[PDB]
Amino acid sequence: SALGKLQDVVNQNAQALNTLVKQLSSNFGAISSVLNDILSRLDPPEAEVQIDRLITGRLQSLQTYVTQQLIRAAEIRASANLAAIKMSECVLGQSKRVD
Amino acid sequence: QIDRLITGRLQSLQTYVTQQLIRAAEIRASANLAAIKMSECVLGQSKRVD
Amino acid sequence: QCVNFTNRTQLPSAYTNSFTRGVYYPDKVFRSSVLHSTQDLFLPFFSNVTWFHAIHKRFDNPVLPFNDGVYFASTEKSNIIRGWIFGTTLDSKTQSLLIVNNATNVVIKVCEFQFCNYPFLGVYYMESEFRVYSSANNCTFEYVSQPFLNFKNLSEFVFKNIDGYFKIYSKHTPINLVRDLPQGFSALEPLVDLPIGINITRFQTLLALHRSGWTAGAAAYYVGYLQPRTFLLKYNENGTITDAVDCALDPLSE
Amino acid sequence: DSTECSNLLLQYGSFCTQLNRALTGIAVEQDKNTQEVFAQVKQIYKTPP
Amino acid sequence: DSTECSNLLLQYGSFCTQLNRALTGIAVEQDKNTQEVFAQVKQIYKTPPIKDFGGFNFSQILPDPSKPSKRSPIEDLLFNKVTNGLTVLPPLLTDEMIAQYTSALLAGTITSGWTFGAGP
Amino acid sequence: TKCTLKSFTVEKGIYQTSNFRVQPTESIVRFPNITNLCPFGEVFNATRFASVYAWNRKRISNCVADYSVLYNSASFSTFKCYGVSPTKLNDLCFTNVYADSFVIRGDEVRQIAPGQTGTIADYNYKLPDDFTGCVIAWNSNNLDSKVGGNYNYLYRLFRKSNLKPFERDISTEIYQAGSTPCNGVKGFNCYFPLQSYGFQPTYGVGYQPYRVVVLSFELLHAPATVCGPKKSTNLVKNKCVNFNFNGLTGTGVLTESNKKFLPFQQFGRDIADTTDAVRDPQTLEILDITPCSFGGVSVITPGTNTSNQVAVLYQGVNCTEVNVFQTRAGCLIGAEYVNNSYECDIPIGAGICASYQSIIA
Ligand SMILES: *[C@@H]1O[C@H](CO)[C@@H](O[C@@H]2O[C@H](CO)[C@@H](O)[C@H](O)[C@H]2NC(C)=O)[C@H](O)[C@H]1NC(C)=O
Ligand SMILES: *[C@@H]1O[C@H](CO)[C@@H](O[C@@H]2O[C@H](CO)[C@@H](O)[C@H](O)[C@H]2NC(C)=O)[C@H](O)[C@H]1NC(C)=O
Ligand SMILES: *[C@@H]1O[C@H](CO)[C@@H](O)[C@H](O)[C@H]1NC(C)=O
Ligand SMILES: *[C@@H]1O[C@H](CO)[C@@H](O)[C@H](O)[C@H]1NC(C)=O
Ligand SMILES: *[C@@H]1O[C@H](CO)[C@@H](O)[C@H](O)[C@H]1NC(C)=O
Ligand SMILES: *[C@@H]1O[C@H](CO)[C@@H](O)[C@H](O)[C@H]1NC(C)=O
Ligand SMILES: *[C@@H]1O[C@H](CO)[C@@H](O)[C@H](O)[C@H]1NC(C)=O
Ligand SMILES: *[C@@H]1O[C@H](CO)[C@@H](O)[C@H](O)[C@H]1NC(C)=O
Ligand SMILES: *[C@@H]1O[C@H](CO)[C@@H](O)[C@H](O)[C@H]1NC(C)=O
For FRET with F76, which of C7, C170, E68, F155 sits at 20 to 30 Å CA-CA? Predict the structure, then answer.
């Protein structure tokens, strides 16, 4: 568990990708989660409604994924800014700052 | 009708979680600053101005 | 022809532990080196499974409910157990399912059989005795296939009836344990899918007599009932289920 | 406590798991923040009488 | 690949452009972060062939010539101990170049102290 | 790039402008091998047929029924299908098939139809109005007629009431046309129900014997198992094709697989529940399904003030699937690799950078 911070970031990113891929299997209230099944089983007046339900569900999932990706990007950017400050002040000089 | 209630409540809950995450990031930044101040002002004497 | 068995010895049926048996493949999909969570009609781990004996004078053929599904385990030697009866009323009023495994082949018939109270097969010391039903009037489905089959052989079967589909799962295990179910894990492969499309609430075990009255060969079987629950299955590099977790058994497995 | 509502809610997938996981991450993050700020000494020092 | 789905998706506007732009910004931000952390020297410093540092041993942190990856034993241990329209873009700086940057920083701080961070 | 950036001047850099998709080329529809044919030889090619009254009924279940062999035969005079068309019989699937076989006259073939009237429909063989199936009839003057007269085929001439659909009457009880009881003797007003057709070869075409097989197709709430055979388009590997294996459809590149399936398993899924392995139903071999290549299309250019030369990067796409150079980032077209190392001007990725001096990478 020495390298838990990097493994934590890798696991969070992989878990977000796995959840985003898994969200395609959900129908979001439609008859099926497969577009081909809806297009082959229903007439276009009701297939348009079913495809619209799938589109809004998948778009909500993608927007949610992008939102947590942006939040994690901000957190990683803050950590990287801290790492650059530590590289400048601890490696390239001697720091009087305690701890 | 239940589907309309579900989508409205789910949108509300996702919105609440989104601002909770943003406030969590802000509080985490403030706590990191507080930890730096605890290390450098309390546990030592700091030459950093202000 | 029907024959009443009047030489039985009265004894209560036993109960024992299921351990980690009764797991079957939920679908026909290959999965390798993965952990898959599935919600299906499964047999709970460490459950109370009913134990019936055939020893001499015990001959256990009671009337048992089917419920959502039946796990049937058999610690068998010398081939006494021959088949099963499924139905609701077990007469000509409703339509019933017959599965038999005689000396040559396995026969599945869906007919309105007028069943005997004590249906049985017989071996003379060759098979020359068959007393299961007195009539068969309306037959819709027939399926003839290959033979499916100290206690030396363990046969596990799972019978389910969902959406007009009769799923039979089977597994054959070489064992050398004397009296009870061995403790271990063995995933049941799917054996057959039958389009019977009939209502089933009651089932019967079919046995075979030994004649040289009658004598019952040494055999033992176990009946368990399926419940809807979630399992976490582990697939190895060769696609074989090697371990399982009951999601609702205890907080550790949860 | 509506069973029908939960059955319809299951069609949307793992949104609830995502929200619970995010809230759990925030909840453990608060404790981590308190550890980082206040638990910087492993010796409990005391003043003289 | 559904044409009807894309035709219905065009009714919602430029949501897809927003999501792609945000992901592109994150992707360039990661490379900017790696540049900010590791690319702080414009000179690639190297250690002398004779490792006479007055008794100080830096073999566990200097790059190993025997390894093809040109990593330190500590860095090699660190790399060993970490294990539908989606694409993964490679990082701009590869692992060997990042290791080369760390090697340059190590050589600068060993042979020159803090002088290389403030000038020549 | 100008279209994407909404500007007529493009600053120096790399801009992701489009996407590339290897479009599918063929459709591969592999279903299982044609085995277990339905016993149509024992119905049509029978050595003797039954009479119209005691008409033979054979129930056909759990096999593969190839109806195109019957439709494309030239030996049948009537192939009139009611309630279904012959072209989709070889596609559709039914729970059971009822094959009724009998012999009637030439002029009596028209009465084997929904909504008709006559002696055969009223007293011998009645078809329902809601009938789905086919009536196949052919001349059998060669087999069923002899020079002395063939009296083996009979028909019920009378009965008190009309038959129900798919009813068989084999009773030999004396018809009572009058008030007086017959008492088993064919006297006055009391006649015998079954009358023979004295089939002779020299008869007219409206009186010659015709063998009729009526196939009745019903759909019941049980799963339909008597399915017509499907075909197998020649498998194409190493190309982006649309695959349909046993009802599982998709688009992908089908390559050889080293995964050893268990005999009961047909498809393969990864962690993310996507189908990445499959078993061919015709030949028991395992095929990997690699998704068809998709990638970002990025344009690498200097300023339009400097030059109009551009390079195209296909991200994560091999160069054989699109001044062509292969990078770890993808395939770069329009730039030439130089062994020299310079400062990074336009970032490509994986240590690769581009610059203008022509465009070099
Ligand atoms: C074997 O025993 C069973 C039960 O004792 C007999 O079934 C009974 O048959 C009688 C017919 O007179 C019915 O009135 C009872 O209701 C039946 N009981 C049950 C539980 O089914 C069966 O007939 C016996 N077999 C023979 C051949 O006599
Ligand atoms: C610096 O430290 C390294 C490692 O601690 C020393 O390398 C060891 O040398 C001895 C004697 O030659 C070997 O038996 C060990 O197996 C070496 N260890 C490793 C990890 O290679 C090295 O000798 C030390 N001194 C100098 C001047 O480099
Ligand atoms: C099984 O059930 C019987 C009665 O039904 C009971 O006596 C026995 O204790 C049970 N066994 C277990 C392990 O619960
Ligand atoms: C087994 O049953 C089948 C079907 O009834 C029959 O054809 C066969 O002869 C039987 N075999 C023996 C040995 O009785
Ligand atoms: C079942 O059989 C009885 C008599 O054998 C018959 O009257 C009835 O119509 C039959 N039902 C079906 C559905 O075949
Ligand atoms: C099946 O039979 C049981 C009892 O005979 C009855 O309660 C149930 O409703 C039946 N189900 C169907 C689908 O007929
Ligand atoms: C998997 O199969 C290989 C042979 O292909 C065998 O060597 C290996 O031991 C098997 N692994 C397990 C866990 O059965
Ligand atoms: C029946 O006989 C005809 C004529 O001899 C022949 O062409 C046909 O192949 C036979 N079989 C079937 C199934 O029609
Ligand atoms: C399928 O039929 C072909 C001949 O068309 C044969 O070569 C092949 O072995 C068969 N496969 C199976 C699994 O029966």
Answer: F155
Distance CA A48, CA A59 (A): 16
**Is the distance from CB of F98 to CB of F158 less than 8 angstroms?**
no
Q: What is the spatial order of strands in the sheet that C227-235 belongs to?
A: C34-42, C227-235, C241-246
* Nearest alpha carbon to residue C103 among C208, C233, C248, C10: C208
Three-class HEC string of chain F: CHHHHCCCCCCCEEEEEEEEECCCCCEEEECCCCCCECCCHHHHCCCCCCECCCCEEEEECCCECCCHHHHCCCCCCEEEEECCCHHHCCCCEECEEEEEEEEECCCCCCCCCCCCCCHHHHHCCCCCCCCCEEEEEEECHHHHCCCCCECCCEEECCCCCCCCCCCCCCCCCCEECCCCCCCCCCCCCEECCEEECCECCCCCCCCCCEEEEEEEEECCCCCCCEECCCCCCCCCCCCEEEEEECCEEEEEEEEECCCCCCCCCCEEECCCCCEEEEECCCCCCEEEEECCCEEEEEEEECCCCCCCCCEEEEECCCHHHCCEEECCCEEEECCECCCCCCCCCEEEECCEEEEECCEEC
Resolution, expressed in angstroms to one decimal: 2.6
Q: Which atom of ligand 2 is nearest to the CA of E73?
A: 20
* A74 touches E at CB < 8 Å: no
Query: Alpha-carbon distance F361 to F342, whole Å?
Result: 10
* C1 falls within a domain: no
Q: With beta carbons less than 8 A apart as the criterion, state whether C118 and C61 touch.
A: yes
> CA dihedral in degrees (F284, F289, F292, F294; nearest 10)?
-170
Query: Cα dihedral sign for C149, C155, C159, C165?
Result: negative
Rounded to 5 degrees, φ, ψ at B10 are: -65, -40
Give the bridge partners for C83, in sequence order: C100, C206
Residue C95 lies in a domain: yes
H/E element, C74: strand C69-76
The verdict on residue C215 lying in a domain is yes
CA F5 to the chain's CA centroid: 50
Judged by CB atoms closer than 8 Å, whether chains meet at F273 and A36 is answered as no
Nearest Cβ partner of C30 from F61, F225, F268? F268
Instruction: Report which protein residue has its CA nearest ligand 9's atom 7.
Output: F283
Residue C3 counted as domain residue: no
Dist CA C254 CA F269 (whole Å)? 25
Q: How many structural domains comprise chain C?
A: 1
Output the domain CATH number for residue C87.
Answer: 2.60.120.960
Residue F158: CA count within 13 A, CB half-sphere: 13
CB count within 10 Å of CB F231 equals 9
From A64, A74, A98, residue closest to B43, measured CB to CB: A98
CB C8, CB C207: distance < 8 Å: no
**In angstroms, what separates the C-alpha of D35 from chain A's closest C-alpha?**
15
Q: Are the C-beta atoms of residues F165 and F203 closer than 8 Å to each other?
A: no
In degrees rounded to 5, what are phi and psi of residue D37? -75, -50
Pair type for strands C219-225 and C69-76? antiparallel
Q: Which residue on chain D is closest to A27 by alpha carbon?
A: D11
Which of C143, C165, C190 has the CB atom closest to F62's CB atom?
C143
The method recorded for this entry reads cryo-EM
Q: Which atom of ligand 7 is nearest to the CA of F260?
A: 5
Q: Which residues partner with F139 through β-bridges?
A: F210
Residue A45 contacts E, CB cutoff 8 Å: no
Centroid of ligand 9 to alpha carbon of F243 (angstroms): 19
Instruction: Determine the structural domain holding residue C220 and report its residue range.
Output: 14-254
Return the exposure string of F183-218: e unless at least 16 CB atoms fall within 10 Å of the residue's CB, then b: eeeeeeebeebbeebebbeebeeebbbbbbbbbbbe
